[PDB]
Amino acid sequence: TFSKNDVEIIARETLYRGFFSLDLYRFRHRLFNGGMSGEITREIFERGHAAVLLPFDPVRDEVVLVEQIRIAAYDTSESPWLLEMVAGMIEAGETVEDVARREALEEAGLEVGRTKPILSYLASPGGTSERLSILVGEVDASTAKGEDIRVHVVSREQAYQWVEEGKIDNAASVIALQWLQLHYHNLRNEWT
Amino acid sequence: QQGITFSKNDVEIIARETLYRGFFSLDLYRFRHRLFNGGMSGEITREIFERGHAAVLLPFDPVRDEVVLVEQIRIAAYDTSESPWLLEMVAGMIEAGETVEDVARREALEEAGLEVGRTKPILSYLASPGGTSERLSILVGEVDASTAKEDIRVHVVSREQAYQWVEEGKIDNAASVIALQWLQLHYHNLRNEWT
Ligand SMILES: Nc1ncnc2c1ncn2[C@H]1C[C@H](O)[C@@H](COP(=O)(O)OP(=O)(O)OP(=O)(O)O)O1
Ligand SMILES: Nc1ncnc2c1ncn2[C@H]1C[C@H](O)[C@@H](COP(=O)(O)OP(=O)(O)OP(=O)(O)O)O1
Ligand SMILES: [Mg+2]
Ligand SMILES: [Mg+2]
DSSP states (O other): OOOGGGEEEEEEEEEEESSSEEEEEEEEEBOTTSSBOOOEEEEEEEOOEEEEEEEEETTTTEEEEEEEEOGGGGGGSSOSEEEEOEEEEEOTTOOHHHHHHHHHHHHHOOOOOOEEEEEEEESOTTTBOOEEEEEEEEOOGGGOOOOOOEEEEEEHHHHHHHHHHTSSOBHHHHHHHHHHHHHHHHHHHHHO | OOOOOOOGGGEEEEEEEEEEESSSEEEEEEEEEBOTTSSBOOOEEEEEEEOOEEEEEEEEETTTTEEEEEEEEOGGGGGGSSOSEEEEOEEEEEOTTOOHHHHHHHHHHHHHOOOOOOEEEEEEEESOTTTBOOEEEEEEEEOOGGGOOOOOEEEEEEHHHHHHHHHHTSSOBHHHHHHHHHHHHHHHHHHHHHO
């Protein structure tokens, strides 16, 4: 419906600057019934953007997971140690593919063969700008060995069962493994 | 395999510090945790964006095989999206003492004018646990899509179209991606159960 010409970003006021940033967006935007809004302000968490890799072995039908503590999970989770996808922050001028492949090697010792885009998503766009771009990457699960990080090699079915049971419940891994559950048959044919 | 190794007993949160307090907060977590090789970590600090937690409702009409989406501006999408107006699930913050289902039904009525019949849990996920504590708990809710009526516009589309838009990237916020991928995996049984 509406485009960026229908929004006026008046200011971005730094509320906090540390490792991450918190900015106050001051803006006006067009209304569905006509006209422009008044001035609106929103606190937005700015932490850059990330690349995500689902390491999938199409020959063996196995996924490689990585385990590490995420203290932000503490208050609402059984444990702050999460089972996650390979992922890393994207710095200026870097590509999703470069970051994804680099992180797979350094976080899991995985050489990546072919890749395909899965999806790129906004983690929580009401309060943060963060975008994460997911690839699926062809890996040899027998070469996975491995910031304190532990590598897990599991069947695809087990990984998806853990999504269903809530044992895997971070957005990137849920999105990637749900996508795999929807596409693994065609993906295994294509990569075999 | 076994799964995760350590539990909350294996981490020591030494202190928390509010670095910024406004509508939301930025807190500094200070903690120590055991290492996979057996030893103890050093003292660690992390900036964590604290904004409470949310309830999400996927409004699904099993008779018509349609979903109801809500469109509204999310300014934070501006920098990485062609448009900051997003197609989203019904959603609202959970305040103390409220249940997910209570918020979900209330938000469904006031964001989309929808009375909700039966509900089922989909999933509860951490939006981005490296830097924010936020958890969002998703339910699917039985609605009559023909009755579907913050500046918010209500959209009614078939499940296949909505899932196509996930694949095309036109729906690309986590809550809606997770819910609609789940729907694509479960709609057959859900339609049987609710018919
Ligand atoms: N929430 C946070 N608040 C403050 N600093 C953080 C936060 N999360 C991570 N950091 C810092 C700590 C680390 O020095 C740096 C990157 O951490 P980490 O992800 O463990 O490194 P890495 O290079 O092994 O992995 P990757 O590149 O995949 O992110 O970011
Ligand atoms: N990032 C933000 N910074 C400051 N205020 C905000 C922010 N996001 C939302 N608000 C305020 C504006 C609204 O008056 C109030 C709730 O907004 P709205 O999105 O319509 O409701 P909601 O129940 O869906 O909340 P939420 O999006 O937090 O889940 O929160
Ligand atoms: Mg990582
Ligand atoms: Mg609302």
